[PDB]
Design a binder for these strands. Structure first.
Lengths: 59, 59
RNA sequence: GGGCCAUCAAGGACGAUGGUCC
RNA sequence: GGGCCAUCAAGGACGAUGGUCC
């Protein structure tokens, strides 16, 4: 697993079509952004594992 | 652009082969990890833009 | 306007809301 | 053990180091 260290306002990159950003921090909480095409799925771990269970997002 | 909020010890997911984690915080600094295959590139924004300039890693 | 804390957010938005202090 | 600040890390490791305060 690759790891990196950055500060509020910086970014990271993946593949040739994905980019990630650290918009800020709030104690034990964190605020981050993602810049991938809607051609690929993007979800929290608390819900990605329920989507990939054999279903899709609700109405 | 998609934005999420996360906490130290939790994760996010992208595509069907990429996962991201927030290992902790350090004030204005942050510690984060990436769990993608080495079949896709993963670098900091401060260097990815120098790789894709027309060259590759120093080794 | 800012610091601190908590919750929601199948959301594609540099996402939202509540509490506390100045 | 923890808060704050700074640096290295083309790194694939839940990466490293320094300053400051309690």
């Amino acid at each position: 697993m690759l790891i990196l260290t950055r500060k509020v306002g910086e970014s990271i990159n993946i593949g040739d079509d994905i980019t990630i950003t650290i918009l800020g921090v709030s104690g034990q909480q964190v605020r981050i952004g993602i810049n991938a095409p809607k051609d690929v799925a993007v979800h929290r771990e608390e819900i990605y594992q329920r989507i990939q269970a054999g279903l899709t997002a609700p109405d």
